[PDB]
Design a protein around this ligand. Structure first.
Ligand SMILES: NC(=O)c1ccc[n+]([C@@H]2O[C@H](COP(=O)([O-])OP(=O)(O)OC[C@H]3O[C@@H](n4cnc5c(N)ncnc54)[C@H](O)[C@@H]3O)[C@@H](O)[C@H]2O)c1
Ligand SMILES: NC(=O)c1ccc[n+]([C@@H]2O[C@H](COP(=O)([O-])OP(=O)(O)OC[C@H]3O[C@@H](n4cnc5c(N)ncnc54)[C@H](O)[C@@H]3O)[C@@H](O)[C@H]2O)c1
Ligand SMILES: Nc1ncnc(O)c1NC(=O)Nc1ccc(C(=O)N[C@@H](CCC(=O)O)C(=O)O)cc1
Ligand SMILES: Nc1ncnc(O)c1NC(=O)Nc1ccc(C(=O)N[C@@H](CCC(=O)O)C(=O)O)cc1
Lengths: 290, 290
């Protein structure tokens, strides 16, 4: 039977690490770090996630605020707010919760966040730097997936990995991190990585997962991954969070639990790890390391 | 037996398209496009490749100059030359031929070329834009592979693709182009893409290629791709160029020719396509579309 990895427990540990780093940063005479989160509209999942972020900030001693704005705001008004926060020396980290409304260009908005305060790692320079294996502010959810694997000791070098999903914010960075050189400035996982997506037929997906030592599902499709797709002993990391009213992942948890060696639950898996790696990025940003 | 795709004939068609585009541009009263190539040292293959590029430029109506510097040049002197070319309004395209001497930081050099003149697409902002599926100057060798596939009419949406190699200028952009969304600003091939590399066990490479509709070898290893690794009728695209006294690719050409449906030869395959796609990028740069 699979070990169930508690992302909640791993995230709490990481937050303890961040709290200590923050406290020693303040005791050294530095300003306490401050995180600003911009929330647009009323997507209730976005509100839940942002509340979890500001909770975690308080736990680790980082000052925070959520600035909530109606969906009817214009792009230029979002940009004006972002520009004010870019020039406010008290703000160390700035992020815009996604998705934004259709009349707002997410890419222009992400590129307007000063790259030094870009704790989500979505600015194009941070994307390019990550894709070149240079030091960069890593996006929180992919970095949380990497930390789950690394802190559990699941090996990656020479291993077969399948990622289901290719979104720029989640699946693509996860595939980048896992396949790239362990010896480069920002090390990668040196795994053999298959990228699948909405046009992979299920039979081709299965033919690739059945070879995989790690399967990472970030499609947002309930029961996309089932025990027959998984070779036994493999690690299955469930990035999906799907409203079905209850929350499930992409993985058939009880089925795959019988065959995988390791498995993450939804909720309590990747989700809390996302919030933890954002706290790590914020103290990194306050320290002006990059 | 396998169709042998002539990279020479496809490139000739692409180059004729560029010659028509450039002369319509010049007929409209615009400055003739101009490409500057910087060439460092005496790598015989580099000199050979640069001559192919400026020979192609002249035939399609693009003015060119190659600026040759000894390998003993320093990093500051190369940067000085690059800055002079960035500010010369006659120069539309600027590229530095790689590899550079060991004492030169290639990443610093590539980021010094202004992104609007970066016809190789090696600047971090162009790498980031490409990885976000945004309009960008695509690197010429990856774009050549893409064109070989599309112009032969080999389908990609939903097909399995294996790329052997992960280098930032060749293997990684190929994997990015092929797996990404057809509906995005810069369309992608919508394929299921496996990325293999130097830590992929040779047995594991076979188990993925035997599933592959398209194998793309960009590793620089003679005879890495052999007939037992290919399923009957798949397309095999040879990006490697290996000096073995002769030139060969990564594929066992004679053997794989008996099982593949399509195959590219070395020489005369991807190489002339690299030169051709650079001409496309140069007229794009002259038009300042981006
Ligand atoms: N911390 C977390 O766990 C966390 C954070 C953010 C988002 N998510 C969740 O991850 C899932 C998607 O995240 P995202 O940002 O990538 O969203 P997205 O909608 O942009 O991504 C959807 C991805 O699903 C892929 N896909 C669709 N059908 C597929 C299929 N049948 N097989 C393989 N791939 C398929 C699509 O091609 C696309 O790449 C959702 O449940 C989302 O809520 C989780
Ligand atoms: N126009 C062209 O045809 C053209 C242009 C440029 C480069 N190339 C060729 O591309 C090949 C590689 O170019 P590069 O810049 O990527 O060089 P590189 O050595 O930096 O990259 C080669 C890749 O090979 C991978 N690799 C090594 N062993 C492997 C294995 N056993 N199985 C799978 N992958 C393995 C490495 O991890 C690396 O990512 C060379 O032949 C180069 O000359 C061709
Ligand atoms: N959209 C974005 N825009 C900008 N930057 C980002 O990083 C994101 N992405 C997220 O914020 N992703 C995220 C997903 C889940 C949680 C989370 O806390 N999950 C709990 C359950 C909570 C619940 O479901 O109520 C769990 O999984 O246990 C937190 C963040
Ligand atoms: N290094 C770089 N730095 C900066 N930007 C780049 O794009 C590169 N990469 C190349 O320039 N790659 C390249 C490889 C081969 C040819 C070529 O013309 N090949 C012919 C003849 C081979 C022969 O006879 O020697 C063939 O294969 O048919 C052209 C370009």
């Amino acid at each position: 039977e699979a070990v169930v990895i508690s992302g909640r427990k791993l995230a709490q540990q990481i937050k303890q690490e961040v709290r200590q780093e923050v406290e020693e940063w303040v005791a050294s005479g530095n300003k306490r770090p401050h995180l600003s989160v911009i929330l647009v509209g009323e997507n209730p999942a976005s509100h839940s996630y942002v509340l979890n972020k500001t909770r975690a900030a308080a736990v680790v001693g980082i000052n925070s605020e959520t600035i909530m704005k109606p969906a009817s705001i214009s792009e230029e008004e979002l940009l004006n707010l972002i520009n004010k926060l870019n020039n406010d020396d008290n703000v160390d980290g700035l992020l815009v919760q996604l998705p934004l409304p259709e009349h707002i260009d997410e890419r222009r908005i992400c590129n307007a966040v000063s790259p030094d305060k870009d704790v989500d790692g979505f600015h194009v320079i941070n994307v390019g730097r990550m894709c070149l294996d240079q030091y960069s502010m890593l996006p929180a959810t992919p970095w949380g997936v990497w930390e789950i694997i690394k802190r559990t000791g699941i090996p990656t070098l020479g291993k077969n990995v399948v990622v289901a999903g290719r979104s720029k914010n989640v699946g693509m960075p996860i595939a980048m991190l896992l396949h790239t050189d362990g010896a480069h400035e920002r090390p990668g996982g040196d795994a053999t990585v298959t990228i699948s997506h909405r046009y992979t037929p299920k039979e081709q997906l299965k033919k690739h997962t059945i070879l995989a030592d790690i399967v990472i599902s970030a499609a947002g499709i309930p029961n996309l991954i089932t025990a027959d797709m998984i070779k036994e002993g493999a690690a299955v990391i469930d990035v999906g969070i799907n409203r079905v009213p209850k929350l499930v992942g992409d993985v058939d948890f009880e089925g795959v639990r019988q065959k995988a060696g390791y498995i993450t639950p939804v909720p309590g898996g990747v989700g809390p790890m996302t919030v933890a790696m954002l706290m790590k990025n914020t103290i990194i940003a306050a320290k002006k390391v990059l």
